[PDB]
Amino acid sequence: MELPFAESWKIKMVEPIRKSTREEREQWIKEAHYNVFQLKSEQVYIDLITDSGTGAMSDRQWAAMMLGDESYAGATSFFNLKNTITKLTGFEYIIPTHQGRAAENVLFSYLVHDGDIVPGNSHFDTTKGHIEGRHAIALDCTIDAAKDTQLEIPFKGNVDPEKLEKVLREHADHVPFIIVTITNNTAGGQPVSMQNLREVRTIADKYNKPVLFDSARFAENAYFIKMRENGYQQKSIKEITREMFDLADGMTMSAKKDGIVNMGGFIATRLKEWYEGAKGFCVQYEGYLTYGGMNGRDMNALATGLDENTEFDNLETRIKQVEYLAKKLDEYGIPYQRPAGGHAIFVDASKVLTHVPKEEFPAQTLTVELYLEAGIRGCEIGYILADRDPVTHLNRFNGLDLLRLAIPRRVYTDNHMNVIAAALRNVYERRESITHGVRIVWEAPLMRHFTVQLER
Amino acid sequence: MELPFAESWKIKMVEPIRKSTREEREQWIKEAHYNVFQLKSEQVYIDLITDSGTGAMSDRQWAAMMLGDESYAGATSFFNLKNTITKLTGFEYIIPTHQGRAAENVLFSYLVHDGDIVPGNSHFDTTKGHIEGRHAIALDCTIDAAKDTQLEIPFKGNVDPEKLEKVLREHADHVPFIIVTITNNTAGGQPVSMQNLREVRTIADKYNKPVLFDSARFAENAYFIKMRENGYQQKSIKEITREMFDLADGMTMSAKKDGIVNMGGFIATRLKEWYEGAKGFCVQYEGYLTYGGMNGRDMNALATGLDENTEFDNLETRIKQVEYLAKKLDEYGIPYQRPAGGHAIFVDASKVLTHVPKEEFPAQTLTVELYLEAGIRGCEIGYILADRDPVTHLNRFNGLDLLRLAIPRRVYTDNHMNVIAAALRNVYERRESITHGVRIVWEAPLMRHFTVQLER
Amino acid sequence: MELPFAESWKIKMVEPIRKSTREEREQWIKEAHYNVFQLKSEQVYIDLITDSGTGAMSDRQWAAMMLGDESYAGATSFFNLKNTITKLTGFEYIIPTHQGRAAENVLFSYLVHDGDIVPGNSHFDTTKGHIEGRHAIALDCTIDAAKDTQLEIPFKGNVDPEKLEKVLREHADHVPFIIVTITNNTAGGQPVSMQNLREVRTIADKYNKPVLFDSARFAENAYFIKMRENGYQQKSIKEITREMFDLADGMTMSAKKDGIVNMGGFIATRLKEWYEGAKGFCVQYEGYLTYGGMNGRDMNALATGLDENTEFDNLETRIKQVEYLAKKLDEYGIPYQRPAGGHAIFVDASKVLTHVPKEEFPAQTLTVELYLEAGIRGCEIGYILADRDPVTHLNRFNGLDLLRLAIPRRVYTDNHMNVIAAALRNVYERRESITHGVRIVWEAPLMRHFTVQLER
Amino acid sequence: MELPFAESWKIKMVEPIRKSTREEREQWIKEAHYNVFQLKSEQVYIDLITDSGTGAMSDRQWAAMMLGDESYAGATSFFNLKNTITKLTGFEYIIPTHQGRAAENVLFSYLVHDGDIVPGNSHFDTTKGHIEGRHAIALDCTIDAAKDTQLEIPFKGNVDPEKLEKVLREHADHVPFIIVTITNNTAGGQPVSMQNLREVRTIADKYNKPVLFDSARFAENAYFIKMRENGYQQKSIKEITREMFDLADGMTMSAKKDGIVNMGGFIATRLKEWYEGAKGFCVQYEGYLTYGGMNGRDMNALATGLDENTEFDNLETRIKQVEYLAKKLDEYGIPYQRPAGGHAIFVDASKVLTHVPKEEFPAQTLTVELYLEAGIRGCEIGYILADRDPVTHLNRFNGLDLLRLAIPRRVYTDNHMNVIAAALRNVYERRESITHGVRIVWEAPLMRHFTVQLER
Ligand SMILES: *Cc1c(COP(=O)(O)O)cnc(C)c1O
Ligand SMILES: *Cc1c(COP(=O)(O)O)cnc(C)c1O
Ligand SMILES: *Cc1c(COP(=O)(O)O)cnc(C)c1O
Ligand SMILES: *Cc1c(COP(=O)(O)O)cnc(C)c1O
């Protein structure tokens, strides 16, 4: 009697998926040294390694790409992108960059100095790389609830105001800025509340500090505020977006997420000092100030995607697919970081491969098993990703050990989601049989997960 | 434990769907005079009016379009298309046309003369137009089982050999050729067996007549032979395709169906007499002999699509979506032409709007109701489409009265299919309440369904 | 001191040109039986066989194609095209067709009956085919000056009002309409004056007859009115366009010319009787009334191209290239139809191959020689194209014998134009050596030039 | 009698050019503070500010873009690009980056340490930025002839072997590698001979040093070797390309030049130590090792462009346009860096605005004048670009003071080139009238030319 949900868009172009045998996968995963980053695209059946830059654009984004201005200085495509951003966020100063880590690279080489601490909620791992690489400290202040995977709360990505107050009371003198990541990617794609953004703003104001939003998934965050925060049920995504950024002094964004483009990023800010200070590094690292390592056609696609993905229906379609996957997982009893976030499901490996020693890397082992089972490639957000202690050279076994299933936007159907959950069900139903994980054979000094070799 | 089915492709580009209120639809269906062909695209939520030319192309088809040769004579794109066709069918003579009815127009103005009878299984309605328009008779010889909607048989589209033998014994002298439509579109997208194609070939051979295949959905037909005809379980689609056309003297094809292109068609044949006889009409009606009203980029896309859609996985994905829709209909008890065909579900209106007089057009009434309910546009394959008797000026109430739900290829998800079936469920569950249909206000002389005005 | 002219556009995408040896061309022209329509695209170096549908679209046309609505009924792309046409011409009734001869096919099967005469200026050869094919007479009333190739006048394509008055005084009863072709293609792409369009309108009004414009190159015509007709120097192309069509009752158009699209056409009219009378034939020959054998993406490209090519700068760039080619021809003393027209140069073969008997087809011989010389493919607009007398079966040697050099829009540079003129210079400078032309070996009944076989 | 030259390609898509009045330009150049980098694209009529990334791709590059694999790890598009590079250069290790300065950024943060000297021929200015920014010295060893603008020699970009020998004899201990830029961009796009590449290789071998080629225009360089170096007249571009890179240990390339793509770059090398040492910086600055800040569709376009632009005809078409521009300049007596190079004409401002003090920046003044005259935007390669001395804070007035006219590949016609030369003629013919240049109002610390404000 009630019409069931369906996507607010329809398909205009397709591309093939390749299928494979378990015998083929056995040898392919061996030739990759059991590191899925080393698997070839052609060897993956359903690729969930990340939602970054893997999504399908719309017909209006492709039309925008046919109008790209490729001129080196002052392209119409850049002012197009610029005005869209200012319109949507209120920030008047825009620096284009080619991706998110380039925006961090450009901005942090002005703002981050040796010895600084940069507090916030959970820093994404390229973001942490650009802070620690400058001999600064990325200080996690996420609420403790984030590490209770089965605890259900509406805004598990929030910053604990007590934790932030403490760092600033003790080190305000070497705190150059506060960074809030929305949604909170590494805590499992969990949203941050408008209340919490005001909390952060009020504390930053007491200590006269600027606030930076890592904004890769700000649109997913605005959807969660609309759906869960009382007082926002009737506001538009565009309304909630502007309210959010009124509480920030600047943003950095990998547009490869909530722009739904295959490439692109930017810095945007209200502070002339930041704009002027970062300009030099964009010219040296990315390109001239009006393209920043982005094609004209790519900034056009981004301008259109930012406007398109700040509309409710499009966000709703994306996030209900993620929730549908969760629903299937729940149906099979497979534990994950609750409640389902915006962009991915984070399967709690500690509670799936229970017969595998933490020292033998369970989440990485689960990654391998799922790929062997059905050719589905996920990504480990656990012990290997967390790196070794720089002085003790010891592994860090006390954090979450998760298998991330990141969903490229508007690429896979809910039938593919059924295959994912079923393949995961099969692995889960043989847990009392999975007793030895993996062992690092060769290992890099930093961000080893990209390049680590392994056995078994 | 067994992995469920999923599509053998993934999405690369999307476009929006527009939603509407019942109040908007009320006025829009009135301003169309309750003829859905007159509704604007923007006023339809899910468009099932036809699978012809409405499908989504693949990335390799779009790449092929970037290489289109637009030269007026001898484009590389034409020889590309030509060699693909000869390769796949064995026919050496190809005449390009812009669509299917153009291929009929071109070929029948050489072959069809006044007074001829053209027997076959159920002739599609543009095909019938080009025979009757030349004062010839399109004689239906489909097996009688086709009109038993609830009877389940594997090849309900077959030609009855007794019926064909009879016409030829009586009128062989004015029979210019036999036409077999594969799949049988107007009988509900029902397949024709390889056995039946040999039956037709043997009778045509006895009377020394040529055989023409209306081939718009020959690929769907080959899939049904592979899946249902004993002795073909292990043959490739490309194998079955060639076997099929070895039994024909020529083909006519709306490539807008099983080419999965938005435009295109052709004649192909093994008879030099046919090739030479139709050439003049292509130049006069369509264009020069090496493009035939088709862009170079469009013949490239067609060449690629013919090769791509003669592969099992792609056909399987398409046809299981249609079967999934059927499964939902069965779950709600909604009657249709069994078993589900290749491209569409034909809801049996006689058994859904049982409280509506045949004189008040039930299937057309159901079309209107479904659009009012959920904005889904179907198409009436019943009394209105069947036209009036040319001499008696009376409606023909003894044929099937169906609502066709045609599925554009690779456009809608199985979630959209759930919405379709649910919307249809709702209409069905209020059948004891739907007592007056529609009345023709203005009416055309021939093919009135495109242009007919109606009330209530 | 004065800046020289340059194109009002720049290049955004290129494609290759193939070069060849004279030995290769010798065999290729033989395997084509010295009919250049039979040459493969790959065997031509510079293709001037026609400007119809061979042009390069703009970035905004390609963007429009990414937004094409492929729905079968009521596509947004069709109403887009429709409103553009009504805006630009004042005609409210539009019937889409896939090309120009389809628009003639559709409209003349309502308007042209056996025994009618259809007077006008020089009828294009598909247009003449659709009149003579219906057993009607296409009566040329072009001013006699058109056949004086070296006479320079501003509007050599005009209709002689005395000639038109005469036919109507004698046969008004069997004249269904008057047709004016703008520009006058077969008289050498020569314009028609606004004065002459009023002359035609006033005579048609005296006899209460409707006027139809064959409008394939109406934009080139408007440019010539702006540049040569006193009183229009300061009017916009869009202004002149509307004034022109205010004097017509309907138009037929191959948009493959002044739309600068690779496919497309339409009928447009102010007469409901014409609209209603042609509707049935569009459904039977072309497609449903809202696409007419055109892709949605193709009607979008057409909508944009009609607006873009009714702007002065774009027309000026096109036509000055044609004039530049003429300037080079004049520099080498090579005679052509003066003054240069809109879309092509018509070399007067009678005055170039003076040592070749008219019976041995000089213009066709020149076509072959130019291709042998430099791989440039032109087209014969002379004795072969003019056909044999239907009763006497004799060739018609009293008309112009021309080699048309048609320039695809925005495809070739002025450097390619230099190559053309130089290659033609070389042939011309050896005229006292070129003494035997060609002989028809095999010949078709009608429009033999497409399909004629020849020797020497 | 001899056919003149024409382009080996034809046009497939166009985009508009905007025209303007001198009054508009007056205000636009003022609102840019007489810095043309600050002019908006829409305010430029013919944009010659750079050939980097501004060119028009081919139909096969656009087809390749429709097949781009956007997967984050192991995209088919990356191995496509990789194998093309290895095939063409013999280098087996490839690191993708988004542009040229990113490839320098990634590679030099492994190779360049404080106190090093990096000798070579004239270092491009982002390249110099990445050496000097690491507190190293970029030591120019170009032959002295390069600064004699009117001296005509075949390989004016060569490295002086005496100069290179000297640096290595004195500082071999702090020389990490030798860099050869081909063609020599900042010396006026002047080629380097194969002989000179062997000279460099032999000296580097004596001191056991590796050689790096800045390879942005290696294809133009191979064309000049084929056309000017004795012993290479009959070798293919692909042959000369491989011979060239056999003498290098690695390359860095802005593919935005001789790839003819709008974005892209890479490092390629034969040294595993370099590959392994740079990997970490690609992940931190550009992206994962199999896309490096490049779209899949962009690496496909690059793969195709590298193969396409290592073919003689395509290079010949490009470079003869540059030579044609030179020919016109010579015709008007306008001095430039002789002989014309690959990609641009460098007008010698010292010999054009002779009535302007060097302290008032003549080349920058000429830039402004040409833009005022005809809306043509060039770029100053003179005193402003050369920066101030880091300790003395004094301008460096002893180098060349040039106005670079960089030609985007396959964008502008030879008619646009005529406009360029004519506009430059007009400025030149009023030199005895141009007596005051410009004055720095606001000035940046480094690479001031991008961001410098000026007056008069
Ligand atoms: C993806 C990611 C980034 C970095 O963006 P890239 O485009 O991959 O360089 C930054 N922040 C978050 C939260 C991310 O998920
Ligand atoms: C679609 C259809 C046609 C006609 O093709 P068009 O491209 O629409 O002209 C012919 N035969 C069958 C079976 C069809 O379904
Ligand atoms: C091209 C032509 C036509 C016919 O158009 P097509 O698109 O080729 O069918 C009609 N009139 C004129 C003047 C033409 O040049
Ligand atoms: C363009 C240029 C570079 C830098 O490349 P970008 O893509 O602009 O970062 C390096 N070397 C030379 C010779 C250049 O001309």
D190 secondary structure, DSSP code: B
CA-closest candidate to residue C378, choices C360, C356, C358, C352: C352
C51 touches chain B (CB under 8 A): no
C314 CA to chain D: closest CA distance, Å? 9
| Residue B367 in contact with ligand 2 by CB distance below 6 A | no
Indicate the resolution in Å. Answer: 1.9
B76: enclosing H helix or E strand: helix B76-89
Interface membership of D13 toward C (CB under 8 Å): yes
**Does C37 reach chain B within 8 Å, measured CB to CB?**
yes
Residues of B marked active site are found at: 72, 124-125, 214, 216, 257, 449
Pocket test for ligand 1, best of A257, A404, A409, A447 (most atoms within 8 A of CB): A257
Tell me how long chain A is.
456
Q: Is the CB of C254 under 6 A from ligand 3?
A: yes
Report the interhelical angle of B237-246 vs B76-89 (nearest 10°): 80
d(CA C288, CA C100): 17
Q: DSSP string spanning D385-450? A: TT-B-TTT--B-TTS--EEEEE--TTTS-HHHHHHHHHHHHHHHTTGGG-----EESS--SSSTTT
Pairing type for strands A178-181 and A211-214 reads parallel
Task: Tell me how far apart the alpha carbons of residues D454 and D450 are, in angstroms, rounded to a whole number.
Answer: 12
Q: How far is D382 from chain A (nearest CA, A)?
A: 19
The Cα-based distances of C77 to A139, A456, B113, B427, C296 in angstroms read: 55, 58, 38, 32, 5
In sequence order, the 6+-apart residues with CB closer than 8 A to the CB of B265 are B96, B97, B98, B99, B100, B102, B103, B252, B253, B254, B255, B256, B292, B294
| CA D449 to chain centroid | 16
SS3 B91: coil
**Beta carbons within 8 Å of A36's beta carbon, 6+ residues apart:** A29, A49, A367, A368, A371, A377, A378, A379, D73
- Cβ atoms of residues D34 and D454 within 8 Å: yes
Q: Which chain D positions have a beta carbon within 8 Å of B62's beta carbon?
A: 66
- Determine the distance from the C-alpha atom of residue B295 to the mean position of all C-alpha atoms in its chain, rounded to a whole number: 23
CB C285 within 8 A of CB B102: yes
Tokens representing C174 are 């069997």
- Report the residue from C17, C19, C429 with minimal CB separation from D10: C17
Is the minimum CB–CB distance between B71 and chain D shorter than 8 Å?
A: no
Quick check: B170 contacting A, CB < 8 Å? no
**To 10 degrees, the CA torsion angle through B168, B170, B171, B173?**
90
Torsion C256-C261-C267-C270 (CA) sign: negative
CB of D69 closer than 8 Å to CB of D233? no
Instruction: Find all residues with CB under 8 Å of B244, minimum gap 6, and list them.
Output: B182, B194, B197, B213, B218, B221, B222, B225
Residue C297 backbone phi and psi in degrees, to 5: -60, -30
Do B73 and C294 make contact, defined as CB atoms within 8 angstroms? no
Alpha helical stretches, state H, B10-75: 22-31, 59-66
Q: Is B185 close to ligand 2, i.e. is its CB under 6 Å away?
A: yes
Q: Is D345 helix (H, G, I), strand (E, B) or coil?
A: strand
State how far the Cα of D101 lies from the Cα of D52, in Å rounded to an integer.
Answer: 12
Rounded to the nearest angstrom, the gap between the alpha carbon of residue B455 and the centroid of all alpha carbons in its chain is 28
Encode A317-339 in three state secondary structure. HHHHHHHHHHHHHHHHCCCECCC
State the Cα–Cα distance between residues D302 and A262, nearest whole angstrom.
16
Q: C6 contacts in D (CB within 8 Å)? A: 413, 415-416, 418-419
| C89 Cβ inside 6 Å of ligand 3 | no
Specify the pairing of strand C265-269 against strand B57-58: unpaired
Q: What is the DSSP letter of C349?
A: G
Closest residue of chain D to B70, computed from CA coordinates: D12
Nearest by Cα to C337 from C144, C195, C187: C187
Which residues of D are catalytic, by number? 72, 124-125, 214, 216, 257, 449
Mutate which of A52, A184, A258, A447 for ligand 1? The one with the most ligand atoms within 8 Å of its CB, which is A52
Which residues share a beta bridge with D106? Answer: none
Ligand 4 binding pocket includes D254 (Cβ within 6 Å): yes
Whether D189 lines ligand 4, by a CB cut-off of 6 Å, is no
**Closest to D194 (Cα-Cα) out of D267, D246, D119, D259:** D246
C397 is catalytic: no
Contacting residues of C for D5, CB less than 8 Å apart: 415
CATH of domain A59-309: 3.40.640.10
Q: What is the DSSP string of D124-145?
A: PHHHHHHHHTTT-EEEE-B-GG
A427 class by beta-carbon count within 10 Å (0-12 exposed, 13-18 middle, 19+ buried): buried
The residue annotated as part of the active site, out of C103, C216, C268, C421, is: C216
Neighboring chain D residues of A128 at a CB cutoff of 8 Å? none
Query: C147 catalytic, yes or no?
Result: no
Chain A hits for C75, CB-CB cut-off 8 Å, are none
Is the minimum distance from the CB of C126 to ligand 3 under 6 angstroms? yes
The tokens describing A322, both together, are 């993620």
Q: Which is nearest to B268 in space by CA: B129, B101, B82, B80? A: B82
The tokens describing C220, both together, are: 């080139």
Binding site membership of B52 for ligand 2 (Cβ less than 6 Å) = yes
Candidates C9, C14, C410, partner chain D, best to mutate (most D CBs within 10 A): C14
Closest ligand to the CA of D258? 4
Question: Can you read off the two tokens belonging to residue B427?
Answer: 């209409």
Length of chain C: 456
Which chains border B (3 or more CB–CB pairs < 8 Å)? A, C, D
If we measure between CA atoms, which residue out of C55, C109, C105, C118 comes closest to residue C255? C55
Q: Which residue has the tokens 């709702």?
A: B426
Closest Cβ opposite residue C263 in set B126, B295, B451: B295
Structural contact between residues B222 and B244, judged by C-beta atoms closer than 8 angstroms: yes
Q: Which ligand is nearest to the CA of B72?
A: 3
**H helix runs in B148-228, sequence order:** 161-171, 194-206, 218-228
Residue closest to B310 by CA, chosen among B182, B223, B184: B223
Three-state secondary structure call for residue C100: helix
> Between A4, A10, A418, which is nearest B422 by CB?
A4
| C185-to-C180, C363, D144 alpha-carbon distances in Å | 11, 17, 63
Torsion of CA C412, C413, C417, C418, to 10 degrees: -140
- Name the amino acid, one letter, at C385: L
User: Hey, which of B52, B98, B212, B385 would you mutate to test ligand 2's pocket, going by the most ligand atoms within 8 Å of its Cβ?
Assistant: B52
Q: Which of C435, C350, B234, A256 lies closest to D71, judged by CA?
A: A256
C166: its two tokens? 């005469």
Smallest Cα distance from C98 to chain B, Å = 7
Torsions phi, psi for B201 (to 5 deg): -60, -40
Q: What's the full length of chain B, in residues?
A: 456
Select the residue from C66, C76, C308 to test the A interface by mutation, using most A Cβ atoms within 10 A: C66
What is the three-class DSSP state of A109? Answer: helix
Of all helices (H) and strands (E), which one includes residue C25? helix C22-31
Task: From A322, A455, A444, select the one nearest A385 (Cα to Cα).
Answer: A444
Whether D64 and B62 lie within 8 Å, measured CB to CB: no
Ligand 2 within 6 A of CB of B254? yes
Q: Does D76 touch chain B (CB under 8 A)?
A: no
Neighbours of chain C (3+ CB pairs under 8 A): A, B, D
